[PDB]
Amino acid sequence: GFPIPDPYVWDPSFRTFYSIIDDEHKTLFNGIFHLAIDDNADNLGELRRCTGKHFLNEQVLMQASQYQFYDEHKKEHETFIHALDNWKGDVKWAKSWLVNHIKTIDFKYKGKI
Annotated binding site for Fe cation: 25, 54, 58, 73, 77, 101, 106
- 26 contributes a contact to a copy of itself by CB under 8 A: yes
In the list Cl ion, a copy of itself, none, the entry touching 16 (Cβ below 5 to 8 angstroms by class) is none
Interhelix angle for 70-85 vs 91-100, to 10°?
160
Distances, alpha carbon 55 to alpha carbons 23, 24, 49, 107, in Å: 13, 9, 10, 14
Residue 39, SS3? coil
- 102 contributes a contact to Cl ion by CB under 5 A: yes
**Contact criterion met (CB below 8 Å) for 80 and 106:** no
Residues that bind a copy of itself (CB under 8 A): 7, 9-12, 17, 19, 23-24, 26-27, 29-30, 33-34, 42-43, 45-46, 48-53, 55-56, 63-68, 81, 85, 111-113
